[PDB]
Amino acid sequence: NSNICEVCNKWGRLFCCDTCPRSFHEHCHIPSVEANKNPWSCIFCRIKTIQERCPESQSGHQESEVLMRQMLPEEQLKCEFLLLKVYCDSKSCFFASEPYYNREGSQGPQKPMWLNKVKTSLNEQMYTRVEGFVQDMRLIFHNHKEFYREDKFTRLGIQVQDIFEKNFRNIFAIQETS
Ligand SMILES: [Zn+2]
Ligand SMILES: [Zn+2]
Ligand SMILES: [Zn+2]
């Protein structure tokens, strides 16, 4: 197995996947690495299994249909994986913890949002449909772009949103378009 965490790229107390060479810190994996379970398969392996059991799940889908799906176990897992893919980018640090807003010429957002809040919300089964999760994720980046205005720091929001959106289209097999 790898000797660094797949998500944060650091060593430490790592848990190894039994079905692939990836490794994880306990709370870097989503959901948090399960207590017992031998063997244990990581979320990458669990996602690959869903795909393998239902090859047709990779055919193109409309975003509108995906968003309305209820958060049954497979859609729960897909949103956990998508959140984990955003944490995999180092730029996610800017959006992880609770933000605060005190900049001359800007006002903070009406509804602040951050990754760890979305993580807790998933863990607590607070989303009933994929749409709830996707709306909170997109709100993170929208708040950032609106608050930072013309500061070049707005680009970090565009960058991490692009990681989100690419992974959303991949994981949920959104129909390819120009
Ligand atoms: Zn880690
Ligand atoms: Zn694995
Ligand atoms: Zn089938």
Side-chain angles (χ1 to χ4, degrees), residues 30-32 76 80 83 116-127:
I30 309 179
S32 293
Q76 177 77 31
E80 291 162 346
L83 181 57
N116 295 349
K117 185 174 171 61
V118 179
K119 183 180 279 201
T120 293
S121 296
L122 280 171
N123 175 245
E124 294 181 8
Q125 307 162 298
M126 300 285 291
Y127 298 112

Side-chain angles (χ1 to χ4, degrees), residues 51-57:
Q51 287 173 17
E52 284 179 346
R53 289 177 160 156
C54 288
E56 71 268 26
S57 73

